[PDB]
Design a protein around this ligand. Structure first.
Ligand SMILES: N#Cc1ccc(N2CCN(C(=O)COc3ccc4[nH]cc(CC[NH3+])c4c3)CC2)cc1
Lengths: 262, 56, 209, 333
């Protein structure tokens, strides 16, 4: 009905604005604050930039798609929206495992990697993700509603594993090794409690949000598309959850954030 | 050793005591007269013009 | 004279390149404050690893180190300490074979541990003259400093415990060690302490620890 | 003998305190109540000199009011150009630490020192001309009298005049109890002052080499000090979070500039060309612009993130340049 649609339009527009609001402040805080100009923080900044592009490119077009269930912006914009949706949520996915790879070397190597960490080597990692992201969206260009184009199942299985399950296997393997390095450093028991809660929120927020959607990829290479539309916005719900996790852990930014806006 | 510090302090205090001290009203008038004299000359007190200002 | 202004800008291009190359070199190096009481073996550890301030420039295990031993100042301690608030770790030397040292140094340790600038800075406690201490406790024990039994393991541990007691600061691990007079490779202990400090900062920044 | 000397010294101090109170008929705040204030005037940020790695600990303008020198904990002493916002020189220091800096009135020599206990002079290639080594403690402040002469304070409890050509102490100024932090030369360069850790400024004589008179207004340690343009008064920043004006003629504390919100101490102070505005750099990342007569903050400067260390107004009074631990020199106008 229409009144349920008004609540849905109000909900998703609020989420779209909340993602834009969270990401816009995080990018502004790194650039404005002089102390935060470091190779570690630029990865968190670029994670906010990717999630910002989800909230600008994908989000406001996705709100109209869910409520109507029928395309109304030409076939050209349809081509740009899906590919951008993939790249942005593949860049947002790959940014977390890149921050994980940045942290992994920062914990296990530490003294060696301290010298290697530079704003250029930081910028190289962001370039590789964007080059990887666009190259996952480049293959589907073989062409009423603007659905995703399934034709080569070999490309579907190639896309999903490269743009989720390989990051998933990487991220759990990295944070598995970081948590062992963390506990060995700890052993006091109260810190160990935080170590578990910190590792759980970083890893769990990534899995709980995205695992439902990329499972649906393999299920529909079964059930109707109501659940699909839920898991897309569950995945876009990660984009606003990502900055608030990665900023909450950092004491310098969380201090800088309150200092900026009272 | 201890007497030398007291003697040096007493000699310094004796020299510092014998001085021509004047009133606060007389001294403050000199400081106020100086500030009023250089009031137009000061760039910071009354903000300077953009042409004459080198930074602008 | 636009060329004259360009020549002045050309001088600054050389200065900007010089500062950037020197700055990144000074940034990667580990800066260490060497504090402690007099006659505690402050210069001995610097000599073993390798007149106001005394600089050191030794390197060990693929990393540059910079020990800084303040001494002969006897002035307001609050002034020269804030000059280097950004040290990686405060090396603190303690004379074990000495009781004036034991109470006087422990008070100085407390103040530096409690100093507004150094509460966000780790400490590497060195309990020097351990060989001389072991022989000294047999003749005259550690009964003067309140209490426990008179033994090398117990007496040295209670000293370490008392320095560890005056911590009062989360995110500030005190790394203790007992050198035999001044004839042991204790530069690796500084590396081992600093390695733990850098990882602890990386964890603390990450969210863990 | 010891008790008799202490009783005689206390009687002289009581006679001195009575003499100051007898002179004080009116106050500075009373006679300047009728005078109209400065008002809401705050200087805009003209420049932002970006080229320091570590915390800037001191800076000083030249005579021309064109070039400004700035010393920092990087082990780098940069001579800037205020107009062109450009590097003129960049002198690499012997010791990495530097708590003071000076620049000659002739515009030739450049002085610096700190935890070395040496006032290293540099002639404008650049190299060491005369390393003035003869202090027991850290060099706290130093200022050029002329091209030949130079005066220095230290943590050894004693200031000392030097000769650059000879390379030796001409006369030693002894008097303070705690470590001396700052000094300030008069316009005439015949007398000077110096605040110390024992909460007491002391007026010295350059030619004579003796303490003329002591000033005791502050509670906590005096960090900074600066002369009034005419040369018959001076202001002093302290750890007590209160700037205090003093008169050399009256020999007493004229006026105290303070605020309840301002809790942290003062790092550096300086007057304008006229001496109406008294600027003061605080430890809470700000620099309030006080009125010297009205006893109220006209404006406030807040460019820096970390605490301001040094404060330097130009000779002609065109601009101010506040250095800071953020590693920036923001020029005001
Ligand atoms: N009924 C139904 C139904 C309709 C379409 C789909 N698809 C979703 C899974 N399919 C894919 O092509 C995989 O899509 C990807 C593959 C990698 C990706 N990386 C990021 C995203 C953005 C998703 N929000 C993304 C999306 C086939 C179309 C599933 C069920």
């Amino acid at each position: 009905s229409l009144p349920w649609k008004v609540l849905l339009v109000m909900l998703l527009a609020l989420i779209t604005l909340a993602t834009t609001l969270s990401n816009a402040f995080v990018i502004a805080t790194v650039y404005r604050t002089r102390k935060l100009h470091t190779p570690a923080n630029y990865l968190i900044a670029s994670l906010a930039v990717t999630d910002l592009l989800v909230s600008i490119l994908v989000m406001p077009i996705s709100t109209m798609y869910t409520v109507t269930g029928r395309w109304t912006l030409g076939q050209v914009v349809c081509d740009f929206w899906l590919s951008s949706d993939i790249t942005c949520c593949t860049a947002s996915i790959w940014h977390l495992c890149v921050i994980a790879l940045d942290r992994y070397w920062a914990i296990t190597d530490a003294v060696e990697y301290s010298a290697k960490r530079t704003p250029k080597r930081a910028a190289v990692m962001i370039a590789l993700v964007w080059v990887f992201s666009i190259s996952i969206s480049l293959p589907p260009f073989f062409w009423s509603e603007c659905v995703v184009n399934t034709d080569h199942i070999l490309y579907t299985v190639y896309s999903t594993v490269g743009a989720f399950y390989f990051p998933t296997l990487l991220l759990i393997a990295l944070y598995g090794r970081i948590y062992v390095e963390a506990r060995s450093r700890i052993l006091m028991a109260a810190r160990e409690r935080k170590a578990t809660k910190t590792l759980g929120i970083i890893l769990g927020a990534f899995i709980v949000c995205w695992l439902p959607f990329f499972i649906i990829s393999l299920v529909m290479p079964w059930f109707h598309l109501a659940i699909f539309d839920f898991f897309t916005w569950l995945g876009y719900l990660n984009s606003l959850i990502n900055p608030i996790i990665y900023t909450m852990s950092n004491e310098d930014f969380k201090q800088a954030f309150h200092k900026l806006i009272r | 050793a201890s007497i030398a510090q007291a003697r040096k302090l007493v000699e310094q205090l004796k020299m510092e005591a014998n001085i021509d001290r004047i009133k606060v009203s007389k001294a403050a008038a000199d400081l106020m007269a100086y500030c009023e004299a250089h009031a137009k000359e000061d760039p910071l007190l009354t903000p300077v013009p953009a042409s004459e200002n080198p930074f602008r | 004279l636009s060329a004259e202004e360009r020549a002045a800008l050309e001088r600054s291009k050389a200065i900007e390149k010089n500062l950037k190359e020197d700055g990144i070199s000074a940034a990667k190096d580990v800066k260490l404050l060497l504090l402690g009481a007099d006659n505690s073996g402050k210069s001995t550890i610097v000599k073993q690893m390798k007149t106001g301030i005394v600089e050191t420039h030794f390197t060990f295990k693929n990393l540059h180190f910079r020990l800084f031993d303040v001494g002969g100042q006897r002035s307001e301690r609050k002034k020269w300490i804030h000059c280097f608030e950004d040290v990686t770790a405060i090396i603190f030397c303690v004379d074990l074979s000495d009781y004036n040292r034991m109470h006087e140094s422990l008070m100085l340790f407390d103040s530096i541990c409690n100093n507004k600038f150094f509460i966000d800075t780790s400490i590497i406690l060195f309990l020097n003259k351990k060989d001389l201490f072991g022989e000294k406790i047999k003749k005259s024990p550690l009964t003067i400093c309140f209490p426990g039994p008179n033994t090398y393991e117990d007496a040295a541990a209670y000293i370490q415990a008392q320095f560890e007691s005056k911590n009062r600061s989360p995110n500030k691990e005190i790394y203790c060690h007992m050198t035999c007079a001044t004839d042991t490779n204790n530069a690796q202990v500084i590396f081992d302490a600093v390695t733990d400090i850098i990882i602890a900062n990386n964890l603390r920044g990450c969210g863990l620890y | 003998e010891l008790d008799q000397l202490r009783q005689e010294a206390e009687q002289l101090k009581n006679q001195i305190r009575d003499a100051r109170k007898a002179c004080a008929d009116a106050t500075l705040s009373q006679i300047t109540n009728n005078i109209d204030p400065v008002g809401r005037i705050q200087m805009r940020t003209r420049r932002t000199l970006r080229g320091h790695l570590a915390k800037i600990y001191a800076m000083h303008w030249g005579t021309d009011s064109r070039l400004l020198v700035s010393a920092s904990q990087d082990g780098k002493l940069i001579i800037w150009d205020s107009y062109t916002t450009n590097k003129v020189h960049a002198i690499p220091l012997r010791s990495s630490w530097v708590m003071t800096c000076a620049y000659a009135p002739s515009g030739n020599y450049v002085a610096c020192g700190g935890l070395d206990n040496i006032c290293s002079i540099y002639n404008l290639n650049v190299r060491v001309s005369r390393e003035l080594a003869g202090h027991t403690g850290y060099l706290s402040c130093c200022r050029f009298l002329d091209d030949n002469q130079i005066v220095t304070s230290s943590g050894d409890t004693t200031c000392a005049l030097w000769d650059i050509e000879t390379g030796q102490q001409t006369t030693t100024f002894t008097g303070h109890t705690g470590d001396v932090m700052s000094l300030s030369l008069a316009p005439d360069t015949r007398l000077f002052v110096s605040g110390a850790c024992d909460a007491s400024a002391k007026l010295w004589d350059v030619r004579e080499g003796m303490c003329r008179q002591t000033f005791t207004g502050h509670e906590s340690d005096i960090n900074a000090i600066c002369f009034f343009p005419n040369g018959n008064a001076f202001a002093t920043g302290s750890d007590d979070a209160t700037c205090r004006l003093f008169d050399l003629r009256a020999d007493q504390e004229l006026m105290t500039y303070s605020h309840d919100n301002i809790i942290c101490g003062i790092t550096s102070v300086s007057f304008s060309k006229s001496g109406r505005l008294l600027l003061a750099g605080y430890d809470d990342f700000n620099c309030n612009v006080w009125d010297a007569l009205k006893a109220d903050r006209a404006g406030v400067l807040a460019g820096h993130d970390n605490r301001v260390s040094c404060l330097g107004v130009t000779d002609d009074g065109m601009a101010v340049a506040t250095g800071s631990w953020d590693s920036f020199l923001k020029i005001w106008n």
